[PDB]
Design an enzyme around this catalytic site. Sequence first.
Site, PDB file in Angstrom:
ATOM      1  CE  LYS A 188      -4.693   0.040  -1.783  1.00 29.68           C
ATOM      2  NZ  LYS A 188      -3.351  -0.261  -1.283  1.00 29.68           N
ATOM      3  CB  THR A 224      -0.965   0.036   1.109  1.00 33.21           C
ATOM      4  OG1 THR A 224      -1.751  -1.131   1.146  1.00 33.21           O
ATOM      5  CG2 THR A 224      -1.392   1.325   1.464  1.00 33.21           C
ATOM      6  CB  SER A 225       1.877   3.708  -1.960  1.00 31.59           C
ATOM      7  OG  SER A 225       2.930   2.856  -2.130  1.00 31.59           O
ATOM      8  CB  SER A 269       4.254  -1.779   2.332  1.00 30.84           C
ATOM      9  OG  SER A 269       3.472  -1.694   1.058  1.00 30.84           O
TER      10      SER A 269
END
Lengths: 222, 195, 195, 204, 226, 233, 196, 196, 211
Positions: H33, H1-2, H129
């Site tokens: 998200k 995920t960013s 991450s």
Amino acid sequence: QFNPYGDNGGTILGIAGEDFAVLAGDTRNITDYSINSRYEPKVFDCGDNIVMSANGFAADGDALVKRFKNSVKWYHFDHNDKKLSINSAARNIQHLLYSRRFFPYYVYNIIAGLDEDGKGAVYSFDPVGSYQREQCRAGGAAASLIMPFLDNQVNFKNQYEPGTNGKVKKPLKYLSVEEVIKLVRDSFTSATERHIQVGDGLEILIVTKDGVRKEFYELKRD
Amino acid sequence: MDIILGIRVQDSVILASSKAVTRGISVLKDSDDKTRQLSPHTLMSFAGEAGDTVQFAEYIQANIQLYSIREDYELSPQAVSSFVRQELAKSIRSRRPYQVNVLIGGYDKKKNKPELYQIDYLGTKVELPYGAHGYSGFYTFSLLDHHYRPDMTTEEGLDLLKLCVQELEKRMPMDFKGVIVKIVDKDGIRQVDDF
Amino acid sequence: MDIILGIRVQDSVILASSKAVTRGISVLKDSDDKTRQLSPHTLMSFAGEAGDTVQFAEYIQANIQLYSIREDYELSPQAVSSFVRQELAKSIRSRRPYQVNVLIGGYDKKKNKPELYQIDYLGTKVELPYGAHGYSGFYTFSLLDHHYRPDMTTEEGLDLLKLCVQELEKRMPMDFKGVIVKIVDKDGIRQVDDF
Amino acid sequence: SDPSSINGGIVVAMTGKDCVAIACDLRLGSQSLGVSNKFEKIFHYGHVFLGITGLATDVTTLNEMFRYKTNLYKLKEERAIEPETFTQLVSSSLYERRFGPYFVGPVVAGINSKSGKPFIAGFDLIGCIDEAKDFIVSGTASDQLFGMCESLYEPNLEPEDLFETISQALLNAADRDALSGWGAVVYIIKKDEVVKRYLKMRQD
Amino acid sequence: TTIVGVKFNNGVVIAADTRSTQGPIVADKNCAKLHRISPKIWCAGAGTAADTEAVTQLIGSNIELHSLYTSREPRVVSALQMLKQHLFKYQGHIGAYLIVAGVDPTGSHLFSIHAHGSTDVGYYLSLGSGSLAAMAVLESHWKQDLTKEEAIKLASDAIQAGIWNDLGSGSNVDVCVMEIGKDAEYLRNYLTPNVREEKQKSYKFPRGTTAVLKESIVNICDIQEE
Amino acid sequence: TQQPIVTGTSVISMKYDNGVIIAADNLGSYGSLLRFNGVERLIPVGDNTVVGISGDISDMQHIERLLKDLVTENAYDNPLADAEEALEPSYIFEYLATVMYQRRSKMNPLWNAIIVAGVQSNGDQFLRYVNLLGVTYSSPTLATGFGAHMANPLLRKVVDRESDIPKTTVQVAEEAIVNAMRVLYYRDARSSRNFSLAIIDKNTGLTFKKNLQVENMKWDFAKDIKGYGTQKI
Amino acid sequence: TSIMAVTFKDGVILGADSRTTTGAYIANRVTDKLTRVHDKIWCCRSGSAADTQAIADIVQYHLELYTSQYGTPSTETAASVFKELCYENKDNLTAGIIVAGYDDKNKGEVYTIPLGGSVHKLPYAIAGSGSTFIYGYCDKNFRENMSKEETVDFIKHSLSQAIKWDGSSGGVIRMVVLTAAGVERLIFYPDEYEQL
Amino acid sequence: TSIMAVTFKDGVILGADSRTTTGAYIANRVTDKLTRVHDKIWCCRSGSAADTQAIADIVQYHLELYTSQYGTPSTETAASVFKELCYENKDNLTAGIIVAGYDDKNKGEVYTIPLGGSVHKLPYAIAGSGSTFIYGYCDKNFRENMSKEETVDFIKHSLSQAIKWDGSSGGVIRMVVLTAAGVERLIFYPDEYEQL
Amino acid sequence: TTTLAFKFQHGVIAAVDSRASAGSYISALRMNKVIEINPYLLGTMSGCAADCQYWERLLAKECRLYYLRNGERISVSAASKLLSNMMCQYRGMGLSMGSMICGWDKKGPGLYYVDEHGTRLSGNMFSTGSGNTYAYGVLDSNYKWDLSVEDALYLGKRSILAAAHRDAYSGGSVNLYHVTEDGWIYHGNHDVGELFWKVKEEEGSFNNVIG
Ligand SMILES: *[C@@](C)(CO)[C@](*)(O)[C@H](Cc1ccccc1)NC(=O)[C@H](Cc1ccc(OC)cc1)NC(=O)[C@@H](C)NC(=O)C1=CC2=CCC=CC2=C1C
Ligand SMILES: [Mg+2]
Ligand SMILES: [Mg+2]
Ligand SMILES: [Mg+2]
Ligand SMILES: [Mg+2]
Ligand SMILES: [Mg+2]
């Protein structure tokens, strides 16, 4: 994983005379190989001519002493300011310790004072509550270093009278307060040399019919 | 504890139970009676973990004795065995289960028949002509399979039982210090003092 | 295996060794002789892990018998015991050590003295008036401490040994099926056929 | 399980005025069980004394080994080995088993025959030397011995005084250790006479 | 253990405390931690004491033979290289942590070496349980272009920090100074700030106090003539 | 039972003749990551106490709120809240120590090490330590984490025992603290250059200094260091 | 650790921080992580210091012996010797090495050798615990055929950020320039790079 | 995920990727998200999807009830509710949340709430991450009081690099703009951002 | 520890050692392992010292309350059962307590063994502790019902001595008790060090040991 216990080192020593008693302990507080304090008192005047020291894990030791001091206060309230005898205090402490049989106070406790006949008294405990009246007791880090010395120099163990060759023992003469304090200072000076957790300072509490008196002596700071 | 045997003959039930009690490496007692009378015509022997055995047996005994007083009536061996099974089946899913295996020997006065029930600590009940718990059956069942008849007398039952104990004493590594034998019949419960 | 005892009296050494051999839950044999003659006046009893015991004893036996033939001379009990100790001390740091405890009973013909040596699997040697291995000493040493004298006869030694076996038979949980007793003296080695 | 505490035992050595002393208990056990009250832990190779504590098989093994080596030393050098030299031999011999060590706590004691200087030394199981002037301790009651020796010891004691001091250090230390006792022996060593005394102590 | 190395103008100095321990117990109150590899190359070690000695004596032996073979005085880089290759081979199982220092025809040198075989270079270093207490002093007071007298002071002050504040360190201070064009001077017990005070009592016993069973003369002499 | 996530490193302190000093850097680490660079870990309580906290930052923020609520609660029905019945350092410490020991006894600790620094009503200096185990001690110098190993030795050279306190001035004590913070920046991998410092004096009161930086650092000697042994270039 | 090697017009530059840690304690704050295996073939070391020193010492030995027999070795040849050691002893090693060198024929070359013992020839390479934080920055700002001064600024800025976020990285920034002109060592102190 | 949230002149923008993985399998390549807890208070989620969804649903409930009684809540108030849940249930949660919102009084605000349950108010925040790879880029390129178009480009470029290096990140780039004007959703596809 | 107790013609003998251990370290030379619950009831101690003291003193509280409610002394059988029921509440919680409840009641002399598992056994002879095997050896070979009070006291004394000698975690001193229908009678503290040498000479035993 969280470890709720710790080891703050230190060593304590209780000796009972004929009409007096002493409770001594070093003033050093430690974790692992570091020094926390060179003067952190460990032996306390708990009232009613009783002195106490809980040696091992300082947090548990401070809590126990704090609780017993409180027990003394409530004994006066509930029983018309009656004096708490040393034997009654000992039994009370047993129940404080066993209240945590399944999450123990990690301390070796000693108390000292005078019995109801005016004679010197020392009571000694294990971490879970077993106790017994004793003449001589060392507790803590250097307990195994000091106790044999006391067996030899206080109770005259393995000492016989010359000429008889092992047939007649050395008689059990009582010790004066001045002679006891010498044994205490020599005990801690020797323990300081050979045990790394022992040193900095020595505080002795002497108990007589006149009250509680203090004496302080420096120790090696290495 | 170690060994408990049971055999149902023509007109009685015979229970044999070892006398040994061990703590650590020392045999503390060689005359222990591993049994409790639940009612005048119902006997229960037991074997399992230390302490749990007696506590369970005495608890069952109290409950059956309470029933007897309340109703002024003796429960049938079948009824008692079912009550015991339920207590063990209840126990196995508890926080700390009672680790006890039992044999229930009784004489049903209504049907005029002896009855032997084998129940393990899980609550596994079976009615049998002869039974045992633990490793005892490994040595003895071959003899019982061979020699057992349903029309046997009490004396023949005792002789076949002696043969079983002799085999155990020969091939078991453990010394169980002999057995106490008890007979359950129409007249009640009695102990065989010489065995 | 289980129990091996030893006692040195005035003019002889007596070794007592159990007869039982167990695999799994079954006693395969009740007449096993846990001993080997190393020389005419030297006897070694043994106890430990299955298989290792006999292999070790026979290996020692072969080496001493080889020495006897080569020199036409019997080694002293002290010399044999030292040889055995070294083999065990060598063994304990091997890839797979031999898990064997021994008692060596011998009569020294030169000094005219009986000698008893106790050696464990680590190679720990001690000369003793009486000895044992494993749990055997826990039950028997109190009796031996009380009753033992160095001027005892062989018959008195056997009576004290009977008392030790009786105590073992009473307080041990394991059934070791009695003992084979052997006597080592100036005339050599003989077995007591009734015990 | 711990090899250094299965059999039990203690050794202590002290220096005096133109003399040394070395002492040991006599116990040998299998954990809680007492097996022998005659297991001496002190050996001598000429005038050099060696006490060994720890695993009894290794004690016996090492004595036989240092007897072997000192007997060859003497045949070749045409003289008895000295304490300083022997100390180095012990250290060398132990370190050659660095990754499979003898579970022992040796103690050397003796007087140099040439200089007349008293000498003691101690080691760990792996060879590290502890050359102390005052005293050396080893065994299951090492903590007890440290406390007794440190408080009772004083320098330049005469042989007959040194005897009392070392004997009391050992006895009272052994009486606070479950795995030590069952008798005791003390060697008093001078440049050309050695006395050996068995002590009377409690047998529990 | 507290041990330090400090470079200065015309050489290098190392120092150490004198306490050796078996856990919380002090075995030796005056241990000698300063070891000699060659006359003008000294090392000092922390960690497993037997390993620091054995590895010091081994490399010192091979260095002496090398010096004889080459007809040259031993270099510190030789001791360094020989040590790290030996320690690396045993993958940290030889618990030797050393500070190595010396002078040779190339100049003055100061290295640290760890048990797994890694080496470092520096003007000031510290090793052992008291390394942090000592390094705090070194980082506070060290400067470039120190004199011999300033460096000995800094070194011993760093050791004292360990003595007082670390329980694994204590007793006295040993020093060795290695200056270029000079013999190395080993100053055993340079400082003595921890002398035991007089005891309050003498514990010398009356003769006959100890009970005895048997006495005997021990024959230490060889077999006699006639 | 938990594990600390976002953490704060050393907190150091000492007594001097007229009061106490305490200091701590402004970093919030996330393991090896130097995640947050503007975190205040010295928290004043009134004008006579400063609580310095190391360890878990989420637990620090929780304690920060307990203290803020403690001040509010002490003012309730208390006309002397800004005078005789104001909060004392000893009161604040004992409260926290009670909380820490209770939490460890429930096996759910506040993963912190705390130093309470202040000046009492009678002008006496107060300096006491407490941590996640409920362990408490007092000394002329106190420090947490790495500061215990590196800072105390430097501060004990100024105040080695109780009798050295009246001989120690505020300029000397502040100088020693600032030097100790530089040493920690050299040698602590979870430390920052930016830090905060607080002085509580019995005469001049509470002085709270923010946005301090470690200065006068020595790095020049690095140019001469080459290789790891034999390398010359 | 934060290490990188970057090719440019005139050759190649190696760069590194100077921090060595034992947990959270900084064992050495002025470490030299730029190590020479040949005159104009240098490497940047990451991972176990014992392992990387032992390897670089063996490689230096091989290239010294190569030179005695066959003349000046290529940068590819040096990277192959590193690889052969790191690959065949992968079970007992923890080494991440960047190899960089200058030829007159091949000019500046960069090879990276990560944990497994694989080899990768690249225009530029980054490695060490602090490299993770600058993957995005370095990718966006790298160009081929930069000037010396541009390349120095690129490495300086990059490692500045790596040091800023990685606690295992810090101290001074060391650099080594490899060109036909020779070998130039550089150093940049905190007061210079922190304010970028 | 960013994920990231950035304040600017007119308010605040939230940004995120769209990849959800179960190991190496991409369970969802078009995940959203960016979740709304109030009209102009949104959050970016990272960690356990079950945990973060459950939390955001409870927070949305609390702020809906807050609004019914006390009127429009502040962004600080929303972050406090997140914190109180994440901190008190830290033993059973794995949630890393960035909270972002717009007031007319306080304008654009950003709060980050990492694993432990601590709260940190910031000008901009990054998490997930993939954030590790852009710490250096974002630090170098962020400015206060940027324009909307500048801020969109900053987030786009930043997440582009995060996606480039992080396998757990990818898909489309979603963005949410929070200003006085209202709420604007944006989307950027691979062919747009990959070629940056 | 080593404890023993046995019934005989003239009541019951109870003998214990006085050692306490903390690993290999002897933490106490002279500890009391007998508790005087009441003038006709005794309790031996083996295992965790704390557990033994707390629970046996709690038993004495409960035995005293029995007397007040019923106006009659509690039986040995009932006292032992109260203690065994206490053990069953803390079943599997980690207590370590081995005890013999000795006394005289209406049924005559009584002796029950009770342990932490809740085990409760009636018998003529028991021995608990790390050295019980050594004590059993002497008891089994010398015990009779027809023992005189003098010979019985010596047997229990000699049996502890045997264990104190061999068992490393047993020793210090011997505490003797004799229970009669008029109550229990303390027969003193006997140092093992002195007792050993005395018994060795007078009995001729321990021949292997030198003195
Ligand atoms: C044998 C000595 C076995 O070791 C006895 O069983 C003895 C019984 C006993 C002693 C005193 C009072 C009543 C009964 N048991 C022990 O000494 C016992 C052994 C032990 C140790 C640990 C466990 O846990 C499974 C069980 C049994 N030792 C203790 O309980 C230890 C902890 N006691 C002390 O260390 C201790 C120190 C101390 C100082 C002052 C006063 C009392 C003290 C005690 C009890
Ligand atoms: Mg120190
Ligand atoms: Mg069944
Ligand atoms: Mg004993
Ligand atoms: Mg950094
Ligand atoms: Mg991707």
